[PDB]
Design a protein around this ligand. Sequence first.
Ligand SMILES: [Mg+2]
Ligand SMILES: [Zn+2]
Ligand SMILES: [Zn+2]
Lengths: 99, 79, 1337
Amino acid sequence: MHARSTGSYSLVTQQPLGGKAQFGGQRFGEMEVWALEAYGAAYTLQEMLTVKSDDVNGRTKMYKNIVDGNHQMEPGMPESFNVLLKEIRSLGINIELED
Amino acid sequence: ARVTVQDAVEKIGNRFDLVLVAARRARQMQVGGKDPLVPEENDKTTVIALREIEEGLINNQILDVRERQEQQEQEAAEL
Amino acid sequence: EFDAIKIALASPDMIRSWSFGEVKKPETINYRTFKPERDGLFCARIFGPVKDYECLCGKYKRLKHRGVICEKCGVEVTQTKVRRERMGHIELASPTAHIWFLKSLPSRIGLLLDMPLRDIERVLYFESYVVIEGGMTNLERQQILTEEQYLDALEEFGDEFDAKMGAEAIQALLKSMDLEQECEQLREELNETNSETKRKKLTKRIKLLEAFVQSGNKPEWMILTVLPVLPPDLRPLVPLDGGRFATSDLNDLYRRVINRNNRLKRLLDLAAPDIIVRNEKRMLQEAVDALLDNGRRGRAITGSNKRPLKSLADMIKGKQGRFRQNLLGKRVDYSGRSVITVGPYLRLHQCGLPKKMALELFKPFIYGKLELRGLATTIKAAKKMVEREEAVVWDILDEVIREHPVLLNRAPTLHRLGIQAFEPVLIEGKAIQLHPLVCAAYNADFDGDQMAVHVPLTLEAQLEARALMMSTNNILSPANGEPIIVPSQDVVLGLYYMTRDCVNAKGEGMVLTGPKEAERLYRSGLASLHARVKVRITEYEKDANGELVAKTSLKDTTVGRAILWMIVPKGLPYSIVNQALGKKAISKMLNTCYRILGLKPTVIFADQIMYTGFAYAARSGASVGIDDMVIPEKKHEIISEAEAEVAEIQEQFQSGLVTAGERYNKVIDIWAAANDRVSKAMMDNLQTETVINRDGQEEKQVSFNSIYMMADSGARGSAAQIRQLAGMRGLMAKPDGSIIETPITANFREGLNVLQYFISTHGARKGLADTALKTANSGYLTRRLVDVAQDLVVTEDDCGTHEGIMMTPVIEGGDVKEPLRDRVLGRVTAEDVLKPGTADILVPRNTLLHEQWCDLLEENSVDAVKVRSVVSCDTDFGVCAHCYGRDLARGHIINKGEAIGVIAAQSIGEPGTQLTMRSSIQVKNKGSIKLSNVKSVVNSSGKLVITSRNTELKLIDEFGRTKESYKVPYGAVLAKGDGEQVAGGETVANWDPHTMPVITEVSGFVRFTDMIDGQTITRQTDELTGLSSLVVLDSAERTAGGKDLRPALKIVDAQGNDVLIPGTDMPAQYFLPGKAIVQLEDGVQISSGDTLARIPQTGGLPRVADLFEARRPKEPAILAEISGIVSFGKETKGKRRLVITPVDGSDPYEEMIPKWRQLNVFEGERVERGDVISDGPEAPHDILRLRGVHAVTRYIVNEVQDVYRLQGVKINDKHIEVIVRQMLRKATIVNAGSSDFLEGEQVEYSRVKIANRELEANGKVGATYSRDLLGITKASLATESFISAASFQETTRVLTEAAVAGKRDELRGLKENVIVGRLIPAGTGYAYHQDRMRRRA
RNA sequence: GGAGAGGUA
Ligand SMILES: [Mg+2]
Ligand SMILES: [Zn+2]
Ligand SMILES: [Zn+2]
């Protein structure tokens, strides 16, 4: 039996750690993302992989809002995607976001 | 308390825009300083919004027209 | 904000533009003072500060000094986040070649420069020479030279011709070329000479060359001169806390390449002999190869443990890469995990939750409530109060939980029902209690399964949970309408034991005043739970317009059934709870209740069913004992007789009277017979052993033996397990597929001895290993499927078309495997059906065929219906609402803006683990006989002899609706003609499936024309009898003499001239094929349809995988490409030739036939396109290109549905049609017309369709396209959006190709929008995306 | 942080 609300954070990619030894959270695996897409559920998926795990400013503001009793979010963009962008740009490939 | 959403879906026959309209109403109710149109029995805002939708005294179009009316008065509130 | 992702090549200047400095030293950390080095791989002056607003030396350490730099460090005092976003750039002394653009297979350098990859491989590693311009001399542009050859050439030609060696040479050669001019030359050359393989080669090269000019990439940028470096923090140097550091191999590769670079820099400065610099440049090239991608070269490099290091290209590919590890599915906060128990006191819409998990998940909400209530005027005090949980916090926690759903999920979540919402109820335990009905949906046994809990935070998430995933909204499985909360295994036993009747129980025959009276009687103990009794009941029927009408009557039932009736809702006929109520009956009862009384009554009724079932099952005390496994008393006699029977055949084969194979087969057969007899005897003695007096003398009834009561009701175990428990347990198979001739003659109530147990052990281990491998493979299958249909979303209201498909009941030769009413239930019609009162419009043309219309079809005995199908909908980038049909997970038409591709893929992949890995026509029903495609004559016996191949016979009942079908082989004799009446069990036709005749058409004399013994045939006269016999020598059998002539046989008359074919003017001479044995003589009378001569003749998961992947079969049944007569040509070049000549058109089509193919047709026969030329599996590609689209789709759906329903699993057809629609999506242009598409381009079908459709509005002529079928594995890669492809397999190839082409992704699928982290255009986000499109545009 | 081994569903 294990639980996690807000604990540590990995280093290279800002996501909650894994395992019970560290105070890590569970893994919303790929197949679960498919399952959520199968419903019409879109908001829950978007928050569940934007503001609950990765987008740092998003989750700080989410915590502030929740404490202040006003449920909302500020999505932003995942940090892991920026990691991928830099890593793929480290080759000769020039990849960027347009207008 | 609610267990189903069937009748509410009957009032709003899409089951997707239902979510958005109910969310907007609950947002008015929680952070906004509005009040319910149905007596509350120690129920949270989401369920109260769904119950309001159920009786058919709030749907998308009436919500929009009420928003327009209150915004018109707000424009008239500065004088 | 942004809207598109652009990808291209990076020129060295741009790379310098990115960078914020230059790396020059391979040193990182001092290991004593943990500051970085001067300007080493890490650094502060290049990348940034180490602490927030802290200069390195400490001259300024406050945010007041933001922006300024230190005068000794030069660092920029600012946040430390800059340390994750600045990039350095190394300077490379020598040019070097990007490995990806060299060994990509195909290699872009190789075919852009158009040199064999071997020679570039040699040149780029400094073991040869290549000329650059090579003019004014014997040499050409790009001849290769060995070292000695170069020395000799420069010796004889010490003039100015340049021949260099390695990366610099490649760079100069590439930079010294003009692209578009080369394109002109190559298109001019491709004009012709030649379109055999040079056509393909030049088309590919021109494609690449025009790709460069179209984009903004210079060719030479594929040669790296400046190499960027990943920021420091994305490759952190984690300490091991043992005073040392971990491996962190990326920094190792960087230091290695920097060492090589500095070595070469020094050696170039100091002017060493050329050998040294060449060696060092080779080493540098290898270092860069290692850094960019380690392994693709001949040998990987390792630090220790003999394990290769992680190159950059290894941090993207594979499960460990970003895409499939940290980008599609992340870890997540606000979660928990636990074990699950049953707790059957819960409503259907709630689940237990331990106190501790509840107080740990919801902590922020508790803080919010505490601060709102003023019990803690800060977050620290509130955190303290929660930490030591003063008694107040528990009531607060209960207050928070009131209406806050959570999500429960299980680990291998296959289908959409694997993750479901619930309300939480706090429990003083440590295990998640789960309602026992949903275990079927989760496939969650309680033998230690763990489940994970998530909480939705925002408001919209809570409402989405409640209105989409709350368990009382998923009752019908998306795969098919069947309910998914069927009472599973124990409640069913309780109900079955409740609705029974002993012939004479306590209190039999009295009369009661309604159900509750019976309940009171039973509880008081005066009447047993089941005894026949008359009771008055008041049914309700709403046959009126939604009005319930009460009607009372005096039924005769058993007190158990009367008690049960007290539970059911109002509007259900009483006969629904009158039978024995097995499992199937309960499922049907729930289905009818749902289809009559909406939803809420059904859910409440299901809950009440569960409660009563558990209660009365517990009352039953249905236990299992060792006396309840009765061994039939005749088992020993049966087995002994079978033993003697085996012994006699053993004796026969001892004396040689029989052969080994026949002895073996007879032994197996008789053992099977003995096994069946034992099973039957056991079952008969088990199911009716109860004989009990009926207050008179004696009678018998259905037995109460516990095992039988569990098996028959359907709780657990079929009859096979009962056979294995009581009767002999069959024959066991040894590993290599053989069947042991000695069965196991011992059940489990008795003991198995050693050997029998050994054999059973082998069988069990085979089963276990098979399950493991099978599930492993099925996972990959489903992952492939969901990645080719993920981008499809019903996105309109009505496409407005008329084409559909003909839905009919399926026939396999025998009975109906699937009626019509279950194939068109819930699919809109295409063309209004006309009742068989023809001109009587029974249904409108665009109505949904729900249950009532299905009944109307059934009573009128409709036969075949035109139904709109999702394979032909004309909407672009999605399908229209009507074309799809009924949602199938809730009883109404599909809502606009719904993701169907994903649910279809999951529904097909979910059952993938339940599959397995490795004469004469006898009409059996009275009815009329009809024949399709009959070309027949009447033979000598008055029967009907057929002269066509596609002749098919249908037996139609008296109604006029087809009921049976059978395939009629060619030249098969038929007792009947057409439109007769057949008696049941009548043998209606017969044929000789062994050998093929030379059947003629009409009577006359038969003349052996061009039939010469010695060099054309052989006089192999029959020797056992002595009649005339002569055998045609095949082309191989005959010598050179008879090669030219063609043996034939022309029908003639007494006059001697050639009698003509009836009807037409082609003289009737039949071309004798090789190896044709003839028995009749020359000029001998024969009758119509007589034998002129004789000429002799997987199902597992891999089948589904192969069928969807569209793999070519082993032995392709080649088809008839076009219509017209056929002929032969050049022969015996290891294969035959076939040519086909239309009636009037050109006849270019010729083809090769391997000799082992039994062409059923002869040359003089005219064949229409689509008729088999050989026999065997039919590939899908030719099916598509010949019989259009509505044939390949039907073939695929029929085959897959066969493989599934043979294992008793139901899947609606739509889920396969959608996959096929997404599969056949690329089109190829035959004629451009007034369009712009080049001749051979393979273009997306949607683009060409819209271009032609809009162009025809003007006076332009559109293009012509031919649809193409690609297996899913190839179809998902050839997609416009390249991020979708990259997240799928083999990122390297697609990524390099896209980079060269300079593609530009526009984020329209359901997957890349997940990657970027914005709303999906699938569900609720569809409204947002609609507004977003309508605003910007 | 990465490897190797064992285990559960
Ligand atoms: Mg289990
Ligand atoms: Zn300083
Ligand atoms: Zn359509």
